[PDB]
From Swiss-Prot, chain A:
Record function comment: Involved in mRNA degradation. Catalyzes the phosphorolysis of single-stranded polyribonucleotides processively in the 3'- to 5'-direction. Also involved, along with RNase II, in tRNA processing. RNases II and R contribute to rRNA degradation during starvation, while RNase R and PNPase are the major contributors to quality control of rRNA during steady state growth. Contributes to degradation of some small RNAs (sRNA).
Substrates-to-products reaction catalysed: RNA(n+1) + phosphate = RNA(n) + a ribonucleoside 5'-diphosphate
KH domain location: 553-612
Any one GO MF annotation of this record: RNA binding
PROSITE patterns for the chain: KH_TYPE_1, S1
Similarity comment: family membership: Belongs to the polyribonucleotide nucleotidyltransferase family.
Protein name in UniProt: Polyribonucleotide nucleotidyltransferase
Chain spans, region FFRR loop: 77-80
Localization terms from the record: Cytoplasm
UniProtKB/Swiss-Prot annotation, chain B:
Catalytic activity: RNA(n+1) + phosphate = RNA(n) + a ribonucleoside 5'-diphosphate
Protein name: Polyribonucleotide nucleotidyltransferase
Recorded superkingdom: Bacteria
Domain remarks in the Swiss-Prot or TrEMBL record: The S1 motif domain is important for trimerization and RNA-binding.
Subcellular localization(s) per the UniProt record: Cytoplasm
GO BP annotations listed: mRNA catabolic process; response to heat; RNA catabolic process; RNA processing
Pfam families reported for this sequence: KH_1, PNPase, RNase_PH, RNase_PH_C, S1
EC code(s) of this entry: 2.7.7.8
Subunit structure: Component of the RNA degradosome, which is a multiprotein complex involved in RNA processing and mRNA degradation. Interacts with RNase E (rne). Homotrimer. The homotrimer forms a ring-like structure with a central channel, where RNA molecules can bind. RNA molecules bind between neighboring subunits. Might interact with YicC.
Function: Involved in mRNA degradation. Catalyzes the phosphorolysis of single-stranded polyribonucleotides processively in the 3'- to 5'-direction. Also involved, along with RNase II, in tRNA processing. RNases II and R contribute to rRNA degradation during starvation, while RNase R and PNPase are the major contributors to quality control of rRNA during steady state growth. Contributes to degradation of some small RNAs (sRNA).
Domain spans labelled S1 motif: 622-690
GO molecular function: 3'-5'-RNA exonuclease activity; cyclic-di-GMP binding; identical protein binding; magnesium ion binding; polyribonucleotide nucleotidyltransferase activity; RNA binding
Region (FFRR loop): 77-80
Length: 689, 695
């Protein structure tokens, strides 16, 4: 028989179970993690040998939300689970971000971790469960890994931190901050936040890091009980028996070259010293093969810039450590789009557009927790010419979707709630050119494009991409980092939010010994640079324009009395069908208390108002008035006062006298006095000659 | 700061704007182009050095219609733009065809030009805006390129030409010709026409070329103001001693080999002397192989055939200049299909099929220009076995769409109007074998398959793929060119139309000096070959068949009153769903009471008529049942005229107050028949003792 090893927790008043040892025995390791009636099966396979022509490390992650886990049949025509959506692909990225730095330097063997959701109760989100499982599975396997990461989701409600909140706490919460870290340090931070201050969110991360300690302790128990024999993988030695000679021949001139002011002359001189030292040392294989020699020269370049940045003022572009690049910000740039903007920051440029739509058009996405409507849609397009090089159109990847979601979190915090503004809005960003941190340039552009469209957005929103360099006790916090300056980042972090408070924070710490002391001054420097940007944006547009641009659809609403419903509906929706086809306009959106008119243009809304007021309780008459002869017989006449239908006036009303014959009223089209003058009564007219 | 550079020529009665230097500054060039307000952002990136040992030119073009440009959010479930589409990959082909020949010979650096539509006004089509933008972007970049190209769309209304017509001007027009050219020559022409004559179509191309020199002038002043420096490209020399030496060792016998009458012996002898010279001739610029020597032999082969064709009548097929391949035609080839044909023309063959459908099966086409729902659908399938090769069936090439649209333009003109013929018709063509033009063979087959399915088309249509070879004052028009006469096609052109006139025209010119005198004699030779083909097509079948084939859906209508309409529906069309599935018959509700009915045969439709009348008729009439029924009670009785269900009746209206007792019979199971009396309180049911439709 087979037997399973089982451990239990109490993690934020939930009972986590790490079952292992009875499933997928051919895989390098496997665990089923369940937290509360919610379970993910996660399994690692890592081959022992990689083809010696492999330079990069192929860690790969897949996360799959099998719909049977929610106990219901798929909605797709093929009745089968489809491609990864936003939802699967973003969760695959959050699991990958903490695991990739923990693997040892120069580890290159191919590793694949596959996480399947197999149960859910709607109250508990599976992503945090999958993160615990991935660190358990990797640390149970023999594979070289620097200790198991925990994970915590932290909510903020009634000025109190709440560990691993349910959907019921999160709908009320002002914060959704996720932490992942080892025993020693935070490794990843991610959040949406309702304009909290810096010291509130740096409280949230350290609370989240303290609470996840139980998970890291329990995984260390399970690894003692059921852990495989460890791998003996060792790296190739650092020197490769040429390090010192090439360092001596390159470094003197190469370290000089970065003093040169002109980007072109600097690049040229660096290429000259590189090509000369490549041409000089052609004595052997792996010099006649440039690759190993060139990889060493590229490493010298990184070392010389890194040392300059710590002590000396000049950067890769000669700016001061904190000197943000120049801005200019055009608005209303595109002729027929609802609102549009062209935000720039050095050589990163983000053309952004906002587009407005009716209650019909909104996205109804289906996910394991629930099928649900939302009304703010953000799409991020990154075409290849943006980086000055050619390839396949679109070029879609996890990073481009990551950047889309991060930007949406930044400005979703500051969107109006539906009662102030009833439209669905799509914001769509074309990255016309990029050389670093294009995601934070896209949130600045979205803030412009919404104000320019005349959405009642609460406040202007901006973002900055920072970094930090550290050596022992020495560190420098730098602002507006380039793509070329990525090597200097021991802590890549992005902050976006209004003057009042921050909308989003994201951090990829790559190294041990970052502290609550350091993160305080780093956020305090980001506050400065972010308030500088808003100083320019407030001059380019000052407040959202009162009136929505002329090409947008219009939605508006009027209050109605409880008796008017039968008049608005008619018989089997006949008056609705007539009104909608007269007006080319949908009106069904409300029918109790109010009616809502959702029109393709302003004239069609006015046309709808005219027609509904000519029908809805317009038939009733209380005083003496005129309305024409419309259709006639001997027995009486049909007489029109308005748009709403009017029945036969009997000839005994029409004629006072005995005769009652059609000769008295034979003339068609005649204008005549007509007052119903009748309450608590069926439809009648007291016209009398 | 950034500073955009603008210019604003007047062209087509609209205001145009060439705005540059503000966006995508990392890209080799970029332009925002805007006419009226239908703006496209178009940018080119071309790498400075070509990857080693390349042979073909990897120019790539793609064009993307972002939906936000029309001011609406996407209707897709993902609420975002996905893959390219029929209406965009075709437009990319229209941008590519005039650009591709205009690059210098031996240029093989990778170039990518990408056009995004960013605003649209529904009256002005963005495609012509993209063509002037692509010309501007390439000529502003340092890329070696033989000057700018303009593009013009020409309409015909009241016997007068109109430049750049609106959608309003176009819907009334008998023509939709697009022409693109430099100041020298009309590099591309592409056109649907409502049976215009030769003089009218060749007038349209010269008009459209005269009044677009303004675009090429304004691009030239912008290139002086804002153009980057022309970067240096030099052609790889190909003029070694071994070129002349291999020619000397090949041309004489290659001339001797091309004299051979038999196709098979010709191919055999050419392959032999190729194989011999590949095996023998040393001093190749690499260890001895095909990799230049075969490409040099291929140049001799091209020169020999081309010179023979200019000097004298003989070709590779053994036919003369004005000659057409052998034809065979047969019709009704596929059973259980509404109509089918097998048009054949030497080694080119198309199994064309027509199928009819309802107004409901019509495909809605969504564009930036608004919805463009249509009723004649053309699909073009080119499987790999058609050319005697293998692999990757069913994944379409850009030219499977390209050829499909050209064929649709050819047969769109002769389709009947909706009131004379109400069915939506899909024409599908399988190219069963091809070594010649497959698109013009598909038009010939489509006109057969529509007549065979009995669609009341105006006239039979055919098409021809001409070619022209030119050498100084020498030129020859070839009336029907194969798949390996490609090197002889300096002017590649395809024309399809009725006896009366042209329905579609397409020309790719890739030589200078094409005068109107040349284009007249070329079209006049196409007229000859096209009338020959109709001579065979008319002899296989004369006119559309008396009515549609017995399997085809026959649609008809009966008028019934609105109280029966609600009774045919029930709730949520549930009675329609039941009756339509029971009868296998389609129906449509209309508010005037004329319900439409469609089935594959008469009897199924008649069954549906009978059932909806019988079910929605009042209960007063019906079958003459013996009303023996149980469940009789003193305080009202349940009585069924028919069926298991038992309806109610009461002490008074059982027997029109003739008695005080509930039933005069006063007996359960008694035989007296029952039918409804009209009176019906909503909370009451009436089923009186009534025989023989007493009512």
């Amino acid at each position: 028989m087979l037997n399973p090893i089982v451990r239990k927790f109490q993690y934020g008043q939930h009972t986590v179970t790490l079952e292992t040892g009875m499933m997928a025995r051919q895989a390098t390791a496997a665990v089923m993690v369940s937290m509360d009636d919610t379970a993910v099966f996660v399994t690692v396979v890592g081959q022992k040998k990689a083809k010696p022509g492999q330079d990069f490390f192929p860690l790969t992650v897949n996360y799959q939300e099998r719909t049977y886990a929610a106990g219901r049949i798929p909605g797709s025509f093929f009745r089968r689970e489809g491609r990864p959506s936003e939802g699967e692909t973003l969760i695959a990225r959050l699991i990958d971000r903490p695991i990739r730095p923990l693997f040892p330097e120069g580890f290159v063997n191919e590793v694949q971790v596959i996480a399947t959701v197999v149960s859910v109760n709607p109250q508990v989100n599976p992503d945090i469960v999958a993160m615990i499982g991935a660190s358990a599975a990797l640390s149970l396997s023999g594979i070289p890994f620097n200790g198991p990461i925990g994970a915590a989701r932290v909510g903020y409600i009634n000025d109190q931190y709440v560990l691993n909140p349910t959907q019921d706490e999160l709908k009320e919460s002002k914060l959704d901050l996720v932490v992942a870290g080892t025993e020693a340090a935070v490794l990843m931070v991610e959040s949406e936040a309702q304009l909290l201050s810096e010291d509130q969110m740096l409280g949230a991360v350290v609370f989240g890091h303290e609470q996840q300690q139980v998970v890291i302790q329990n995984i260390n128990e399970l690894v003692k009980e059921a852990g495989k024999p460890r791998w003996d993988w060792q790296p190739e030695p650092v020197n490769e028996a040429l390090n010192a000679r090439v360092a001596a021949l390159a470094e003197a001139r190469l370290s000089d070259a970065y003093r040169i002011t002109d980007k072109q002359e600097r690049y040229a001189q660096v290429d000259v010293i590189k090509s000369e030292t490549i041409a000089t040392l052609l004595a052997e294989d792996e010099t006649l093969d440039e690759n190993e020699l060139g990889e060493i020269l590229h490493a010298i370049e990184k070392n010389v810039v890194r040392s300059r940045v710590l002590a000396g003022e000049p950067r890769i572009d000669g700016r001061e450590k904190d000197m943000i690049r120049g801005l200019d910000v055009r608005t209303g740039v595109l002729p027929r789009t609802h609102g549009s903007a062209l935000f720039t920051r050095g050589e990163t440029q983000a053309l952004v557009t906002a587009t407005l739509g009716t209650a019909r058009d909104a996205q109804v996405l289906d996910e394991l927790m629930g099928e649900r409507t939302d009304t703010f849609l953000f799409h991020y397009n990154f075409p290849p010419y943006s980086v000055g090089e050619t390839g396949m159109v679109g070029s879609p990847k996890r990073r481009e979707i990551g950047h889309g979601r991060l930007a949406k979190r930044g400005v979703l915090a500051v969107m109006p709630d539906m009662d102030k503004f009833p439209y669905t809005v799509r914001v769509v960003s074309e990255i016309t050119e990029s050389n670093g941190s294009s995601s934070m340039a896209s949130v600045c552009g979205a803030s412009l494009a919404l104000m320019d469209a005349g959405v009642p957005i609460k406040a202007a929103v901006a973002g900055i991409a920072m970094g930090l360099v550290k050596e022992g006790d020495n560190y420098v916090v730098l602002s507006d980092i380039l793509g070329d300056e990525d090597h200097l980042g021991d802590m890549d972090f992005k902050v976006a939010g209004s003057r009042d408070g921050i909308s989003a924070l994201q951090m990829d710490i790559k190294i041990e010994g970052i502290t609550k002391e350091i993160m305080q001054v780093a956020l305090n420097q980001a506050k400065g640079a972010r308030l500088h940007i808003l100083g320019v944006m407030e001059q380019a547009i000052n407040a959202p324009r009162g009136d929505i641009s002329e090409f947008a659809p219009r939605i508006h609403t009027i209050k109605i009395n409880p008796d008017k419903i039968k008049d608005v509906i008619g018989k089997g929706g006949s008056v609705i069908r007539a009104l909608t086809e007269e007006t080319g306009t949908t009106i069904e959106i409300e029918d109790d208390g109010t009616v809502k008119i959702a029109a393709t243009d302003g004239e069609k809304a006015k046309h709808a108002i005219r027609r509904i007021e000519e029908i809805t309780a317009e038939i009733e008459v209380g005083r003496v008035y005129t309305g024409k002869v419309t259709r006639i017989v001997d027995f009486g006449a049909f007489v029109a006062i308005g748009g709403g239908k009017e029945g036969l006036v009997h000839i005994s009303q029409i004629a006072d006298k005995r005769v009652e014959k059609v000769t008295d009223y034979l003339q068609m089209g005649q204008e005549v006095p007509v007052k119903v003058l009748e309450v608590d009564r069926q439809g009648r007219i007291r016209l009398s000659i």
